[PDB]
């Protein structure tokens, strides 16, 4: 289906073989087979292919080697809070001619820029990545929409899949069907939440490799999706800067209108009901222990905050008050008594420079996008860890 005037999706899905016929209905019957999805080989192939696609897509684009210079920076917002992350900066670019240096200005985010070494609280600034590695901006034709991908085995091999609805990732499946190609899974890049994923069929599934070891990561597969809105409201403008012979740089030029906070919106009642049912499914795995929903442990901004992208811009959302409250008893929230329209709103921040996959991949400077960004999504699953404290004899924390 993904064949149009545009072929430069970052996952390069146009080059794949088109699946002409219907998907196979090849149920076997009288077949039992043991499965271990924590030992599956295909996930490592998927991770390697995503890394290789990222490298081969970011390879021919424009580099940012000459831009890493001394930056003289000052305040950009007239405020003193909320949206104070904007800063203004000036520098010296190189024109087409080598001997002609030109004074230039650009706007930046506060997480992108770093005050220079041995500063006397001065205006001297630099980029974050300049003492780590190089960086390349993304080409503006590149579209980051998660087009679905069907993995297929070669001829002479086969793909067996489980059909048992309560299959929690281990154990033998009574209902096993073969198929030529996998279904339309999506390469959605996110952390701490699953977006646009395949829904659980009838029951909220908890998958963990050991369930008592806290080093294992609990995968929570929700039965019903939770719809989430995310937006950056303020009107951004894109400017262009000539750097070197025949290649251009893009940056944030100006903001039009009153600046408002980038945020996300979640229906609070459905989220609490989902957390309540997850607490039911977890307390039936951990009897006589009240669980607690608490914020994640402290660490990096990319690790603590829920990170994703919609459009070409990248979002990092606070989510501390999202994971709040304790579930005890049996269905204590009672859903609701009235027609509540309560929406929990998460504040979010935006980075331009990302060292995605923890530096295994490559640096990218995401170019800014004019206008505004709005994006809608379904939360279908959660990534949780068991904070197994000593005083958790009855009050467990996740």
């Amino acid at each position, epitope marked *: 289906r993904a064949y149009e005037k545009e072929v430069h999706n970052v996952w390069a899905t146009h080059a794949c073989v088109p699946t002409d016929p219907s998907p196979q209905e090849l149920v076997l019957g009288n077949v039992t087979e043991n499965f271990n999805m924590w030992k599956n080989d295909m996930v490592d192939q998927m991770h390697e292919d995503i890394i290789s696609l990222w490298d081969q897509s970011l390879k021919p684009c424009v580099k940012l080697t000459p831009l890493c210079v001394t930056l003289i920076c000052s305040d950009a917002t*007239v*405020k*003193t809070g*909320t949206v104070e992350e904007m800063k203004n900066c000036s520098f010296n670019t190189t024109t087409e001619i080598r001997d002609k240096e030109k004074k230039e200005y650009a706007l930046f985010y506060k997480p992108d820029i770093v005050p220079l070494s041995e500063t006397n609280n001065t205006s001297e600034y630099r980029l974050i990545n300049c003492n780590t590695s190089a960086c390349t901006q993304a080409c503006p034709k590149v579209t980051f929409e998660p087009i679905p991908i069907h993995y297929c085995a070669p001829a002479g091999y086969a793909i067996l899949k489980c059909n048992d609805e309560t299959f929690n990732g281990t154990g033998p499946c009574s209902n096993v069907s073969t198929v030529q190609c996998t279904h339309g899974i999506r390469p959605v890049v996110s952390t701490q939440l699953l977006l646009n994923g395949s829904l659980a069929e009838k029951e909220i599934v908890i998958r963990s490799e050991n369930l008592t070891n806290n080093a294992k990561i609990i995968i929570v597969h929700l039965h019903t999706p939770v719809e989430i809105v995310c937006t950056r*409201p*303020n*009107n951004n403008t894109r400017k262009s800067v000539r750097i070197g012979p025949g290649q251009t740089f893009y940056a944030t030029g100006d903001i*039009i*209108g*009153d*600046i*408002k*906070q980038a*945020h996300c919106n979640i229906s609070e009642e459905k989220w609490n009901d989902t957390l309540q049912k997850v607490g039911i499914e977890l307390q039936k795995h951990f009897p006589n222990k009240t669980i607690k929903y608490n914020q994640s442990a402290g660490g990096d901004m990319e690790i603590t905050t829920h990170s994703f992208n919609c459009g070409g811009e990248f979002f990092y959302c606070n989510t501390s008050n999202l994971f709040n409250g304790t579930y005890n008893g049996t269905y204590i929230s009672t859903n609701s008594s009235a027609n509540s329209t309560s929406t929990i*709103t998460l504040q979010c921040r935006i980075k331009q420079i990302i060292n995605m996959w923890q530096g295994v991949g490559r640096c990218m400077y995401a170019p800014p996008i004019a206008g505004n960004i709005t994006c809608r999504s379904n939360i279908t699953g959660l990534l949780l860890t068991r904070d197994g404290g000593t005083n958790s004899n009855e009050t467990e924390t996740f």
Partner: antibody
Amino acid sequence: QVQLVQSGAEVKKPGASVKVSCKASGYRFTDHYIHWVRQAPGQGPEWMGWINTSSGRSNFAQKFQGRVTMTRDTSISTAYMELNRLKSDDTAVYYCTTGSWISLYYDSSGYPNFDYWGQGTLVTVT
Amino acid sequence: TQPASVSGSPGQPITISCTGTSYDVGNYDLVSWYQQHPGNAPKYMIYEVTKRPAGISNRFSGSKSGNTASLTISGLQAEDAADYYCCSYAGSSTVIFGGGTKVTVL
């Protein structure tokens, strides 16, 4: 009841500068944007710009760039207009208007909901 | 961008039109109407494309068709002889006015 006390009549020569006060009353002044409207005699309205009372962020018409500045403070609930280097056409009736409610999550500063009006003032250029 | 004058007997309805571009009228419903008696401050008449403020009678109503909008005055009296203005968000945090219409109540 909400009401905006504008300042008195200004009579001065061309090339001078005019500051006009607008004292708000009846509401918490941080809640709403402030716009200002000019009106030449025998002529309709004329928009200059707006000011965010929460943070002092302001915007202008393109022909009023540089000549105008806006300030405010919610400590005494007032906002000060300042027009510099007046011309002969700048003789007008000036109106303080309460804009829409100030939100945190959407740009409502451009909303043309001028709910309440000041009494007006006269700026005359001799 | 507004017709200069309109006339009408008391009791009959009329309409006042305003026509702009796609940028100011076509894109957004953020269009307002105001009235102004001579020797008086402009008065708050219509805020949304159709919504009336509290305290405003059923004399007036808002409407929009494509690139233009109109204030329909349902019935008339002499007190509606004031000037009328339309106003709109014009994009890029800019606010413009249509220009005016003198209502001449017969």
